[PDB]
Design a protein around this ligand. Sequence first.
Ligand SMILES: [Ca+2]
Ligand SMILES: [Ca+2]
Lengths: 614, 85, 67, 149
Amino acid sequence: KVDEYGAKDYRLQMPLKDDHTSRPLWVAPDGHIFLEAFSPVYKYAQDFLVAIAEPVCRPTHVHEYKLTAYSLYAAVSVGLQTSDITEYLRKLSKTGVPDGIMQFIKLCTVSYGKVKLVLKHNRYFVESCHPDVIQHLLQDPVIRECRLRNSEGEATETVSFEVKQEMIEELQKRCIHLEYPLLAEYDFRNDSVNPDINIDLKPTAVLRPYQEKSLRKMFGNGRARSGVIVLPCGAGKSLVGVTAACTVRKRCLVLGNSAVSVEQWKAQFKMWSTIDDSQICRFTSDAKDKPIGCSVAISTYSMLGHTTKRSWEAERVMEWLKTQEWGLMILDEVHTIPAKMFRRVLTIVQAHCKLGLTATLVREDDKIVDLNFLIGPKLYEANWMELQNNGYIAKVQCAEVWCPMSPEFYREYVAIKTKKRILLYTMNPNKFRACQFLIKFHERRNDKIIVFADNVFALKEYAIRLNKPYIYGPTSQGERMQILQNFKHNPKINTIFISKVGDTSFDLPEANVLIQISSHGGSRRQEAQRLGRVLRAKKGMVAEEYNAFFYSLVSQDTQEMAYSTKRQRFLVDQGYSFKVITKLAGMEEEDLAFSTKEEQQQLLQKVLAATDLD
Amino acid sequence: ARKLDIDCVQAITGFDFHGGYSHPVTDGYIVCEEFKDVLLTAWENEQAVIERKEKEKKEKRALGNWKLLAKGLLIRERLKRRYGP
Amino acid sequence: VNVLKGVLIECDPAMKQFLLYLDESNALGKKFIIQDIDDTHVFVIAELVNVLQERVGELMDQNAFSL
Amino acid sequence: ELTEEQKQEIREAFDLFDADGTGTIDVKELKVAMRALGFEPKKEEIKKMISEIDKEGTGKMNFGDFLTVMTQKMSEKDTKEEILKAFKLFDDDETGKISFKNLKRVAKELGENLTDEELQEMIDEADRDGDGEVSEQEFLRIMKKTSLY
Ligand SMILES: [Ca+2]
Ligand SMILES: [Ca+2]
């Protein structure tokens, strides 16, 4: 029922009980659950809701989580039944639990853990203790096409059956339509087909409490289970992956976006894992190692997804991989998987346990529901503000700096309606002066300055005018590494311009000042990921609540405002606040570029010279 | 020769140690004399195309430079018409 | 003398250029932007200023987000 | 949007050659028709446009064809006027030609860093008569074959 004010009148279906202060939870029948962080029972309720509910908003006081069938299946995979969860909700719900919510839980829980998929001898078997449901599944024509049949066309016959590998993904979508999700249970200790690997954990490795908690959530009943884990950048995600690989100790495959990530993973395994270097191989197009004896492999999506003809050695590597049975596979930046080519890689590789690690999951193409069956439910996602309080991560100080557009630029901004309009507001002379002032301020403050600019031309123009290193499309790898190492150590270099390549193509040296000038157009996940990757915990400023500094230069009254607001949606959902600043104190005293009008007019000439073709 | 499907083997005439390892030194390609005259005339004609393939590519660039040049003045001209005294 | 009675509008110069664009493109229709007076002030006719305010409000609506 | 008052001129010109009200005018009357509305075509261009309009060999065109041709000629004429103005901007010394020195000076005016060899290459490439520079006719030709305008 809907009130005239737009609020849904839930008073009738939520009978309140007098245990107000003791019970901290509100259970709306829409599926949303509200928790008060100031309650003395916050920690227990937080831990309980993490397993059972998907977080939505985590601000300072009132947190909102959501209930999904995927969340319920994940909780079941943890090992929690319906009765205990319902009792705990009742002991914490301020009002009566709606029956429809209760009915929804009843419907989901019963159907969980019914259908199991097992990979043995390069054959996928669907089994269940209830052949009635199994026989029912035989009715589906899509299942009939997916179910492996004889070479004569005849379908094959605790009863199970082999399934076509190339038809697995379409079957997975059908399981949701059949309301019988697959059970990704792995014989963590009962495996005998795949021999172990002499890889252990070096004593220098330390698992933070949230890291160990997430690992224990993943390893239900001591058995590895495929899933998705969300860790903020700089929280030792690579350490967590190495730890999980050492724990499973079976055949381990890792996938990264670029060869730089591959090298980072190899260094991490050398830093923490006890596996011999000879058993570590990278399937890279430049550094090639034989797949033989490669206990743990690190590769990239493009190498495996190279649909065009590859090198003959690559053919041998692919054949060895297909022959090899993978107990464990590791995927990074899971938000990239929903692409068709990278999705095909999952079909290509035969792996038992597939774990995905990433910092964000808000795909602007909303291709995440199907991702729940590509890998599994989201196992864990840490509270960023909580890690800020715990000191694990730097407490970011975020600002939105409004730079008014020059009227001549603004008149031309209105004049252009096409994609060329981007260059108009991305090249604001007032924005340039503000950036110059901020750079001077932070250099006098002796801070590492990272200037993010998606537009190549704008980035090069800014860097050349300010006489600073710039990173762009080609970015020859030797020069890139040279500039990075100069930035890390040379005190003369503390201002680096990085184009869109800085998101995932390479590791970003730790900095404290991150200035964003150019936007993708609303990539709320990409820019947030890049921000989290840029800024990490810094010693010395641990006590202060603002040890990391981020500033977004936004052109006022432009379409950049809407993009910035849409982009910061996720970060606000993460509890991060953005203060709006218009007037920058100290700019008038300092002398900056484009002080005279014709200088800005000359810049306008230069930008307009770059027409729509550029 | 690959276009004409004629056997073509590089003539290894020496070996160079540059780069810390001995490396093959090749002196052209040895092709059977019977096809040699047939192979030569095409090759020159092949070159007769490739050089032209170069020239056009240069001109196609140069034409754009005109579009790059004059238009750059035009806006500079147009701006002078919109803010000139 | 010929002196006109209308409405004075004071805003940021960006809005001034926006009004110039509207008059030149005739998005408002008839040329109601009779005369500019200052780099931050304009002088218009009150007959169509209300609809002009609507177009101004629409622009800032575009440079915003809906929740 | 093309024209509002010049279309009346084209309609009246069509009516002048269509006093009998047949709906079409003779192609041979097109030469004077261009002269009445201000166009001054050359004989070769007259032949070229007669070939395009009269591919079917009828010799008469309706008002639509005449209006389209007049609009195209007006667009070409104003484009040629703008190209002439651009040449005069190049022709700061009023020599009628864009010599290498003129091109170099006008390029340094924009601050462009195009090499002098590239400048003379551009001069020669747009040079047709081989005089060593580019003429008004050659500049018109290079503008017609330009990327767009
Ligand atoms: Ca001249
Ligand atoms: Ca000439």
